[PDB]
Write a protein that binds this ligand. Structure first.
Ligand SMILES: COc1ccc(C(=C2C=CC(N(C)C)C=C2)c2ccc(N(C)C)cc2)cc1
Lengths: 156, 157
């Protein structure tokens, strides 16, 4: 409630010290804002690595979905935060999580050309044959984007 | 600075009364957050029409860009806020502004199937032949998305 609101603002601001103080006083680690985003969503969205590690250590749901079905891994794969992608997958983030558009984090990472995240997601079991609600796979994204370096990864 | 931070949080929360108080207090209408978004960006992002009109009445930059080159019109075209799209265009928003991906607001509206915003942008001079940095037009989006209704709007031009 009130502590959950201050935790969402502290996570959005990248204040890891403020997040630690809120955790010791029983703040809801999985409080949701107006779009269903948890503090881990915001730390993953803005690239706050040290904030995400504090949240995950205190029981943050690594596979929490917002109102659009996006997980914290969906947001990191969009903005290209390689270090947080690694921390999420180490804490049990589902590489095949799916939002309301049918997108896996592999879809969003392939759309925005974050190939280093694509290979890490493949290492953790991301399915290349997964189709979104528009019948698109990662192969179709490489053709649409003309990304030869992505198609060269999928060929292996 | 201090007042601009509170204006950004007030616009993100949709408190048009709190915004008007900070406006009269001398807050910077074009204050930016860590991603370069103005209060008009946030009001356009979350669909707060009354907040966006208050900002525009007090000299908000209708064509402000964030760190990724997105204008408030780019955000409304993404989230399908039709009422704010018309308000921005009535206040002089560039209907053909591009971001770092070369996307016009017509590209983002066509990607997310916001056909009402597509036609409104066309009424304000949006170029259908505009290509992004990947050589994509709204015709390529209609074929890629398989949007029957979008391709029907484009062929009637
Ligand atoms: C704000 O977060 C996002 C998320 C996705 C996109 C985007 C798409 C792609 C496919 C879409 N549909 C509904 C088929 C809808 C939206 C997209 C389209 C093209 C590219 N390229 C070619 C780099 C990247 C992303 C845009 C922004």
């Amino acid at each position: 409630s009130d502590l959950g609101k201050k935790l969402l603002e502290a996570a959005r601001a990248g204040q890891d010290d403020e997040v630690r103080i809120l955790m010791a006083n029983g703040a809801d680690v999985n409080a949701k804002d107006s779009r269903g985003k948890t503090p881990l969503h915001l730390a993953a969205d803005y690239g706050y690595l040290e904030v995400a590690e504090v949240l995950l250590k205190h029981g943050a749901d690594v596979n929490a979905h917002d109102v659009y079905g996006d997980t914290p891994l969906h947001l990191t794969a969009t903005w290209g935060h390689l270090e947080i992608v690694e921390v999420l997958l180490k804490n049990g983030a589902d590489a095949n999580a799916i939002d309301f558009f049918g997108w896996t984090p592999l879809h969003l990472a392939a759309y925005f050309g974050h190939l280093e995240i694509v290979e890490v997601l493949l290492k953790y079991g991301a399915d290349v044959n997964a189709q979104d609600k528009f019948g698109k796979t990662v192969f179709d994204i490489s053709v649409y984007n003309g990304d030869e370096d992505l198609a060269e990864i999928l060929q292996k």
